[PDB]
Amino acid sequence: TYFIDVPTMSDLVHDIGVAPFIGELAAALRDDFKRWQAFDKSARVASHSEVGVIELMPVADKSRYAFKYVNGHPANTARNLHTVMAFGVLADVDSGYPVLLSELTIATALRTAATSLMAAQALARPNARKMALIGNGAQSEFQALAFHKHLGIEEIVAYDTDPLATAKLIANLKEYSGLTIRRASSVAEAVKGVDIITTVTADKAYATIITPDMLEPGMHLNAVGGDCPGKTELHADVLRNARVFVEYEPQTRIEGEIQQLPADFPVVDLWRVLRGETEGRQSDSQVTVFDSVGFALEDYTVLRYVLQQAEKRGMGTKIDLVPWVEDDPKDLFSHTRGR
Amino acid sequence: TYFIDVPTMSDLVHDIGVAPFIGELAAALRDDFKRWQAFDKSARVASHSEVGVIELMPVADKSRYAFKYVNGHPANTARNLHTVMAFGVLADVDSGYPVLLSELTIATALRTAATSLMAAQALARPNARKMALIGNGAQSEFQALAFHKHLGIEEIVAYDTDPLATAKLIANLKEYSGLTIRRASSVAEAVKGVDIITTVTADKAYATIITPDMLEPGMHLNAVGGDCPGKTELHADVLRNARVFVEYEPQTRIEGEIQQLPADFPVVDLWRVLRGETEGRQSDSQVTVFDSVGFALEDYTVLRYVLQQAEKRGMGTKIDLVPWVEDDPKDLFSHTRGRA
Numbered sequence: 001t002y003f004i005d006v007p008t009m010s011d012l013v014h015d016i017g018v019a020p021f022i023g024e025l026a027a028a029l030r031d032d033f034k035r036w037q038a039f040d041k042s043a044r045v046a047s048h049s050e051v052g053v054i055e056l057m058p059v060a061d062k063s064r065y066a067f068k069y070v071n072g073h074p075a076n077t078a079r080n081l082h083t084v085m086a087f088g089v090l091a092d093v094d095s096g097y098p099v100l101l102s103e104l105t106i107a108t109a110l111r112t113a114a115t116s117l118m119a120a121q122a123l124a125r126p127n128a129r130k131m132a133l134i135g136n137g138a139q140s141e142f143q144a145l146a147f148h149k150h151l152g153i154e155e156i157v158a159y160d161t162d163p164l165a166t167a168k169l170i171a172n173l174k175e176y177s178g179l180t181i182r183r184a185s186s187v188a189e190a191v192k193g194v195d196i197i198t199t200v201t202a203d204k205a206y207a208t209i210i211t212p213d214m215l216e217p218g219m220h221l222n223a224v225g226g227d228c229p230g231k232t233e234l235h236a237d238v239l240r241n242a243r244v245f246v247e248y249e250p251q252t253r254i255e256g257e258i259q260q261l262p263a264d265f266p267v268v269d270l271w272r273v274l275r276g277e278t279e280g281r282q283s284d285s286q287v288t289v290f291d292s293v294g295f296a297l298e299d300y301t302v303l304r305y306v307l308q309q310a311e312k313r314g315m316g317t318k319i320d321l322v323p324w325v326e327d328d329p330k331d332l333f334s335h336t337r338g339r
Numbered sequence: 340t341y342f343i344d345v346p347t348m349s350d351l352v353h354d355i356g357v358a359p360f361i362g363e364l365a366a367a368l369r370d371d372f373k374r375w376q377a378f379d380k381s382a383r384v385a386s387h388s389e390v391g392v393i394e395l396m397p398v399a400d401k402s403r404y405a406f407k408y409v410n411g412h413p414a415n416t417a418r419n420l421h422t423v424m425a426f427g428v429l430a431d432v433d434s435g436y437p438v439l440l441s442e443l444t445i446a447t448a449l450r451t452a453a454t455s456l457m458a459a460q461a462l463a464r465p466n467a468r469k470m471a472l473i474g475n476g477a478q479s480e481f482q483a484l485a486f487h488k489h490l491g492i493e494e495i496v497a498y499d500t501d502p503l504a505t506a507k508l509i510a511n512l513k514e515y516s517g518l519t520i521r522r523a524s525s526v527a528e529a530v531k532g533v534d535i536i537t538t539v540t541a542d543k544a545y546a547t548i549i550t551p552d553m554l555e556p557g558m559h560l561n562a563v564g565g566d567c568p569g570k571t572e573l574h575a576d577v578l579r580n581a582r583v584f585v586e587y588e589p590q591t592r593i594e595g596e597i598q599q600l601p602a603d604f605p606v607v608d609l610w611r612v613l614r615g616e617t618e619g620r621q622s623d624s625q626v627t628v629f630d631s632v633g634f635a636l637e638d639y640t641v642l643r644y645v646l647q648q649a650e651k652r653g654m655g656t657k658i659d660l661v662p663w664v665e666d667d668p669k670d671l672f673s674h675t676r677g678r679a
């Protein structure tokens with residue numbers, strides 16, 4: 001079993017570059033989504049608590065199995081901890097052997113930005129150039145760069161209740177001269193006249209970050225922040241006024257923005273759109289919404305990507321997580337006599 | 340986050356002792372089973388393949404969250420790999436922070452033996468002295484010692500289709516002079532006149548290791564080997580002649596021996612027996628069956644036990660699995676500039 005810890009992932013991402021990492025991952029995600037029906041899918045298992053949730057996100061095909069452990073505690077930042085922390089494993093289906101154990105906190109931000117990018121490439125109007133970024137925390141820089149470097153976004157209007165978060169975002173990306181990022185005094189001000197609205201706020205409760213009055217013809221909404229029951233960012237009527245796209249419907253019906261609508265509210269499966277079998281955006285005036293909550297297949301993709309890229313660079317360290325090949329695999333007792 | 344790998348767990352178990360480890364764990368398991376209602380329980384999630392299964396087993400209470408990754412591939416031994424491999428994590432509920440990452444292959448054998456022991460103490464006749472052990476692989480030595488050291492079993496009659504497995508079992512426990520382990524040439528021969536039958540065979544299919552004609556009044560069956568849909572060890576009629584006990588009913592209805600019986604077939608929750616809310620064994624002549632498939636609470640208990648035992652010994656290695664406290668927890672992007 002190989003292990004990629006936080007500093008090693010940092011070196012890997014730094015080497016590949018955040019922009020290329022996101023672009024290459026989006027391409028890999030698109031191919032895996034097209035192969036949707038080849039995967040053994042399931043809604044992630046969630047263990048809710050008073051201030052957060054801890055989830056396990058498994059998925060697999062005929063040769064590889066993958067899963068991610070991840071928590072979502074919005075109040076963590078008040079204690080100097082990340083709202084989102086994660087790690088995962090890529091394993092061999094025919095033996096059950098865990099080939100890679102990897103940090104996935106940094107990787108989650110990367111796959112989430114890549115997934116949002118993939119969805120936008122297929123759903124947003126091709127002439128998009130301005131985006132509103134509501135929520136300027138951990139996910140924000142990644143979302144900003146994904147859209148700037150791969151979807152032609154030149155101007156971002158940002159807003160966060162915490163002004164220091166916005167300052168951080170602007171400072172982190174100032175080095176990208178082709179991108180202008182400016183602070184707005186409110187959500188309504190930030191979203192005025194934008195082609196794309198990305199929401200990545202963290203608040204474990206029902207919230208109406210985006211209301212019907214803010215919608216303009218042709219907009220694409222990248223709703224990422226809400227991702228579990230009782231945690232939303234869009235007013236229910238925003239969804240009723242748009243064509244809604246999802247990752248894994250069974251899971252999104254419960255955790256996504258659509259949890260606020262009748263169980264029969266029509267949504268479109270993103271993988272069908274990517275295969276060109278179902279219509280995505282139907283007109284230039286239409287409002288499209290990517291009701292994103294995160295799905296195990298995305299973690300499977302980033303885990304496979306990380307393994308391949310780390311191997312090529314000889315990065316990672318071996319760990320004795322489980323027994324390897326032994327003379328007598330039925331003699332587990334031999335391990336009780338000491339190393 | 341601290342990490343306990345295979346060799347470290349080996350040293351830890353060696354220092355505690357297999358029998359003591361099992362005994363202390365059984366006591367800890369009893370306490371956790373008693374507060375069964377305090378846990379957020381769920382049936383484990385499984386991913387099935389043609390040769391095996393890979394499962395995630397989570398459980399949590401108000402303070403701790405735990406989960407185990409584990410596979411079950413009966414054909415692995417032909418490739419010199421273990422049929423069962425596992426690892427898990429114990430985390431803080433109010434922050435989601437993973438405190439311990441630990442190997443759980445060795446630990447699984449220990450908690451399974453402890454669970455079987457705990458069940459047997461409440462279900463088997465208190466005067467049991469002889470046990471049949473069908474399947475002499477990885478789990479066998481642990482099951483053998485649990486019963487010998489904590490349930491007064493002085494004699495074990497063992498059988499395995501692989502004669503080298505039985506030889507391994509006998510040689511491994513020869514040092515325990517108070518325990519006699521003899522090889523039988525068939526399952527029928529091995530179970531004749533025993534007080535307890537422990538089955539830990541590995542075969543991904545519907546097997547009738549134990550048939551009705553083998554049953555004798557007063558027996559307790561510790562059915563451990565079968566643990567998923569389509570994988571059983573007992574003939575359905577064996578269950579019809581017994582009082583059947585389970586771990587987490589919703590999960591066992593799907594994966595246990597009872598998957599072969601009506602959805603309405605009566606079963607008894609082991610935790611309720613331990614709480615004294617319902618009976619375990621009701622008569623000396625009764626046949627009791629612990630339909631064991633494994634449940635996340637057991638892994639939660641062993642993870643907590645391992646953490647405690649490792650801490651007082653200063654064992655375990657720090658690993659950077661996830662970020663810890665930082666000046667600005669909202670600046671994850673700073674981690675993309677390299678470790679330097």
Ligand SMILES: NC(=O)c1ccc[n+]([C@@H]2O[C@H](COP(=O)([O-])OP(=O)(O)OC[C@H]3O[C@@H](n4cnc5c(N)ncnc54)[C@H](O)[C@@H]3O)[C@@H](O)[C@H]2O)c1
Nearest residue numbers: 083135137138139160161162165200201202225292293294
């Ligand atoms: N859809 C997915 O795949 C996916 C994966 C990434 C994370 N998540 C979700 O993304 C959200 C953000 O994650 P993060 O790591 O950036 O968290 P974070 O805590 O680092 O940042 C969230 C930011 O939102 C701001 N915020 C909270 N309420 C607000 C409001 N009403 N208006 C404006 N700003 C507000 C906070 O001040 C904070 O800076 C979380 O809710 C998380 O669960 C989803």
Ligand SMILES: NC(=O)c1ccc[n+]([C@@H]2O[C@H](COP(=O)([O-])OP(=O)(O)OC[C@H]3O[C@@H](n4cnc5c(N)ncnc54)[C@H](O)[C@@H]3O)[C@@H](O)[C@H]2O)c1
Nearest residue numbers: 411422474476477478499500501504540541564631632633
């Ligand atoms: N209930 C639980 O909590 C729990 C936890 C431990 C493992 N499991 C199950 O326990 C079983 C055994 O695990 P292990 O690690 O010892 O595996 P193992 O492969 O090391 O040993 C199993 C043994 O069974 C023998 N066997 C197979 N078919 C047989 C038959 N028809 N008659 C007699 N012997 C036969 C094999 O030759 C082998 O030596 C597996 O099926 C596993 O999934 C259950």
Ligand SMILES: NCCC[C@H](N)C(=O)O
Nearest residue numbers: 071072084227293294295
């Ligand atoms: N707070 C993070 C929760 C998990 C997230 N929805 C994901 O898909 O990773």
Ligand SMILES: NCCC[C@H](N)C(=O)O
Nearest residue numbers: 392409410411566632633
């Ligand atoms: N094939 C998966 C086996 C896992 C075992 N039943 C356990 O409870 O650990």
Ligand code: NA
Nearest residue numbers: 223224226292
């Ligand atoms: Na969302």
Ligand code: NA
Nearest residue numbers: 562563565631
């Ligand atoms: Na069983």
